[PDB]
Scaffold this active site. Structure first.
Site, PDB file in Angstrom:
ATOM      1  N   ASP A  16      -9.085   5.915   0.538  1.00 43.10           N
ATOM      2  CA  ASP A  16      -8.844   6.593  -0.733  1.00 43.10           C
ATOM      3  C   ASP A  16      -9.890   6.266  -1.790  1.00 43.10           C
ATOM      4  OD1 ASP A  16      -5.965   4.441  -1.344  1.00 43.10           O
ATOM      5  OD2 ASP A  16      -8.081   4.055  -1.675  1.00 43.10           O
ATOM      6  N   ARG A  30     -11.703   7.009  -7.027  1.00 49.40           N
ATOM      7  CA  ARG A  30     -10.409   6.753  -6.426  1.00 49.40           C
ATOM      8  C   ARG A  30      -9.611   8.057  -6.385  1.00 49.40           C
ATOM      9  NH1 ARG A  30      -5.899   6.181  -4.540  1.00 49.40           N
ATOM     10  NH2 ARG A  30      -4.726   4.221  -4.402  1.00 49.40           N
ATOM     11  N   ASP A  35      -2.015   6.963  -1.818  1.00 51.14           N
ATOM     12  CA  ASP A  35      -2.304   5.599  -1.429  1.00 51.14           C
ATOM     13  C   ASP A  35      -2.422   5.508   0.079  1.00 51.14           C
ATOM     14  OD1 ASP A  35      -2.819   2.859  -1.926  1.00 51.14           O
ATOM     15  OD2 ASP A  35      -0.687   2.362  -1.770  1.00 51.14           O
ATOM     16  N   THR A  36      -3.615   5.161   0.544  1.00 55.23           N
ATOM     17  CA  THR A  36      -3.853   4.860   1.947  1.00 55.23           C
ATOM     18  C   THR A  36      -3.649   3.373   2.200  1.00 55.23           C
ATOM     19  OG1 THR A  36      -6.259   4.635   1.598  1.00 55.23           O
ATOM     20  CG2 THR A  36      -5.437   6.756   2.337  1.00 55.23           C
ATOM     21  N   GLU A  38      -4.153  -0.423   3.028  1.00 57.69           N
ATOM     22  CA  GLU A  38      -5.244  -1.309   2.674  1.00 57.69           C
ATOM     23  C   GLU A  38      -5.968  -1.787   3.925  1.00 57.69           C
ATOM     24  OE1 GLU A  38      -6.066  -1.840  -0.664  1.00 57.69           O
ATOM     25  OE2 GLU A  38      -7.875  -2.673   0.272  1.00 57.69           O
ATOM     26  N   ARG A  82     -13.196   3.138 -12.079  1.00 61.37           N
ATOM     27  CA  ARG A  82     -13.289   4.160 -11.020  1.00 61.37           C
ATOM     28  C   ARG A  82     -12.928   5.550 -11.541  1.00 61.37           C
ATOM     29  NH1 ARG A  82      -9.548   1.495  -6.350  1.00 61.37           N
ATOM     30  NH2 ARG A  82      -8.055   1.689  -8.071  1.00 61.37           N
TER      31      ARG A  82
HETATM   32  C1  LIG Z   1      -4.635   6.101  -8.019  1.00 62.57           C
HETATM   33  C2  LIG Z   1      -4.612   5.187  -9.256  1.00 62.57           C
HETATM   34  C3  LIG Z   1      -4.680   3.800  -9.115  1.00 62.57           C
HETATM   35  N1  LIG Z   1      -4.677   2.996 -10.362  1.00 62.57           N
HETATM   36  C4  LIG Z   1      -4.702   1.578 -10.301  1.00 62.57           C
HETATM   37  C5  LIG Z   1      -3.219   1.123 -10.132  1.00 62.57           C
HETATM   38  C6  LIG Z   1      -3.454  -0.103  -9.291  1.00 62.57           C
HETATM   39  O1  LIG Z   1      -3.727  -1.195 -10.160  1.00 62.57           O
HETATM   40  P1  LIG Z   1      -3.518  -2.739  -9.622  1.00 62.57           P
HETATM   41  O2  LIG Z   1      -4.632  -3.206  -8.800  1.00 62.57           O
HETATM   42  O3  LIG Z   1      -3.415  -3.687 -10.720  1.00 62.57           O
HETATM   43  O4  LIG Z   1      -2.352  -2.935  -8.765  1.00 62.57           O
HETATM   44  C7  LIG Z   1      -4.663   0.173  -8.490  1.00 62.57           C
HETATM   45  C8  LIG Z   1      -4.292   0.764  -7.120  1.00 62.57           C
HETATM   46  O5  LIG Z   1      -5.529   1.083  -6.565  1.00 62.57           O
HETATM   47  P2  LIG Z   1      -5.860   0.739  -5.022  1.00 62.57           P
HETATM   48  O6  LIG Z   1      -4.950   1.426  -4.089  1.00 62.57           O
HETATM   49  O7  LIG Z   1      -7.222   1.132  -4.687  1.00 62.57           O
HETATM   50  O8  LIG Z   1      -5.759  -0.710  -4.727  1.00 62.57           O
HETATM   51  O9  LIG Z   1      -5.446   1.114  -9.185  1.00 62.57           O
HETATM   52  C9  LIG Z   1      -4.572   3.627 -11.666  1.00 62.57           C
HETATM   53  O10 LIG Z   1      -4.568   2.897 -12.826  1.00 62.57           O
HETATM   54  N2  LIG Z   1      -4.510   5.019 -11.806  1.00 62.57           N
HETATM   55  C10 LIG Z   1      -4.526   5.789 -10.633  1.00 62.57           C
HETATM   56  O11 LIG Z   1      -4.443   7.114 -10.837  1.00 62.57           O
HETATM   57 CA   LIG Z   2      -5.049   2.095  -1.182  1.00 63.62          CA
END
Ligand SMILES: Cc1cn([C@H]2C[C@H](OP(=O)(O)O)[C@@H](COP(=O)(O)O)O2)c(=O)[nH]c1=O
Ligand SMILES: [Ca+2]
EC number: 3.1.31.1
Length: 136
Positions: A16, A30, A35-36, A38, A82
């Protein structure tokens, strides 16, 4: 109101997250609303279907003639810097393709960045009833 803009692939990172050249600058994107599993984070380990999701996104963007990015109507970047977008490979939305295959769940639904939410949830429901991958 949403518009597609061209971008060029630099590198797929995982299921993702992709790095693109956008408007002349490298940027990490992103994928919105998905959510894919990890593959990187130590706390999670390498989750099942993570490698599969990463391979799917990589194949889809590396083989594309044309990549486009579509921002939604709210914030265009997250707290990590991102870009937050829907990404299209030869006119096919990567975000939806992953959900339809059961390689991603609909997640992180933050208004007002939810324009394609219903479309993606319908694809998720179909993947679930077909018991594909994450839903098997
Ligand atoms: C998809 C997305 C993720 N995020 C943030 C939430 C998560 O924060 P936290 O890391 O603090 O948990 C993280 C999840 O991304 P990842 O799935 O790449 O890890 O990115 C956003 O703020 N807005 C979004 O639209
Ligand atoms: Ca992910």
């Amino acid at each position: 109101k949403l518009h597609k803009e061209p971008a060029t692939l630099i590198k797929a990172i995982d299921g993702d997250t992709v790095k693109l050249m956008y408007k002349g600058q490298p940027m990490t994107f992103r994928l919105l609303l998905v959510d894919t599993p990890e593959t990187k984070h130590p706390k999670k380990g390498v989750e099942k279907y993570g490698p599969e999701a990463s391979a799917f996104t990589k194949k889809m963007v590396e083989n594309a003639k044309k990549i486009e990015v579509e921002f939604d109507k709210g914030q265009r970047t997250d707290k990590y810097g991102r870009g937050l977008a829907y990404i299209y490979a030869d006119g096919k939305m990567v975000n939806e393709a992953l959900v339809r295959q059961g390689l991603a769940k609909v997640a992180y639904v933050y208004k007002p960045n939810n324009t394609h939410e219903q479309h993606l949830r319908k694809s998720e429901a179909q993947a679930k009833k077909e018991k594909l991958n994450i839903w098997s």
